[PDB]
Design a protein around this ligand. Structure first.
Ligand SMILES: Cn1c(=O)c(-c2c(Cl)cccc2Cl)cc2cnc(Nc3cccc(CO)c3)nc21
Length: 272
């Protein structure tokens, strides 16, 4: 296993995420004097075999906008998943604390384009992300954004899977078919992407402000959708609305979404 490395090849420096991502640390890959991120399996939380499968999936991921795997420690506990380290943390906190004069309109477009590229890649590689949201996107220097990939599941593109009963998902980012029947497909990620676009346009505001979680589904079925955020370009809002079509088959593919954003980003750049 060319990915396998000895636990002693890495040294832990600081704990990360405040615990919101589980047991994650900022470490050092000694040989290369390289700062890395290290995820360890939190006993009594996720099942070991599922943890190891995520590691297996990451070995197959190679895209500029998906967190890159660097190595794994799977022989014996503690199990480790080592990846590149993103300097600025998650996109949600980044947007909430940034200088909006720097992180302006073209930058928001740039970030959406990068995320859509990552999702287009997953769509082509038979993967879905179980929780696409700003909280799971990481930021690096120069507004580089990479989608975290620990939450990836193997699912043939176009197919649907049914989650266990009692499964708890982020209601405000969850597609209708998931809320009602626990059904998920790549189109469910498209719906989530629309909510993510809203998070970006509002610089990290919470979705459906003030709306009780228990009534989100009842509102969605009657065609209620979040309003266009102040400052949000019409074309981008139109894409959000397309992502939120009730019928999953009516939602655009990430290939189409990425093309749309790439075009807007180019035209916007040509207006330098
Ligand atoms: C929190 N987190 C992860 O869970 C993974 C990761 C791992 Cl270790 C294994 C598998 C999949 C992933 Cl996405 C990679 C990763 C890379 N960079 C960062 N940077 C980061 C996070 C929080 C705060 C700050 C700033 O102090 C900087 N945080 C990261």
């Amino acid at each position: 296993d060319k990915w396998e490395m000895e636990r002693t090849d890495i040294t832990m420096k600081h704990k990360l995420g405040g615990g919101q991502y589980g047991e994650v640390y900022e470490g050092v890959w000694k040989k290369y004097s390289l700062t890395v991120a290290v995820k360890t399996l939190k006993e009594d939380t996720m099942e070991v075999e599922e943890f190891l499968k995520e590691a297996a999936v990451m070995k197959e991921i190679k895209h500029p906008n998906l967190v890159q795997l660097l190595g794994v420690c799977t022989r014996e506990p503690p199990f480790y998943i080592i990846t590149e380290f993103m300097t600025y943390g998650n996109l949600l906190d980044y947007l909430r604390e940034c200088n909006r004069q720097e992180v302006n309109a073209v930058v928001l477009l740039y970030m959406a384009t990068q995320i859509s590229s990552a999702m287009e890649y997953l769509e082509k590689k038979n993967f879905i992300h179980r929780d696409l949201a700003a909280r799971n996107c990481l930021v690096g220097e120069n507004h580089l954004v990479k989608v975290a990939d620990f939450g990836l599941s193997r699912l043939m593109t176009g197919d649907t899977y049914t989650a266990p009963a009692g499964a708890k998902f982020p209601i405000k980012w969850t597609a209708p078919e998931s809320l009602a029947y626990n059904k998920f497909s790549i189109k469910s990620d498209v719906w989530a992407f629309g909510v993510l676009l809203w998070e970006i346009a509002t610089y990290g505001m919470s979705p459906y402000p003030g709306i009780d979680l228990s009534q989100v589904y009842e509102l969605l079925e009657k065609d209620y959708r979040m309003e266009r955020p102040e400052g949000c370009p019409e074309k981008v809002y139109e894409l959000m609305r397309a992502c939120w079509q009730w019928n999953p088959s009516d939602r655009p593919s990430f290939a189409e979404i990425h093309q749309a954003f790439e075009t807007m980003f180019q035209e916007s750049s040509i207006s330098d």
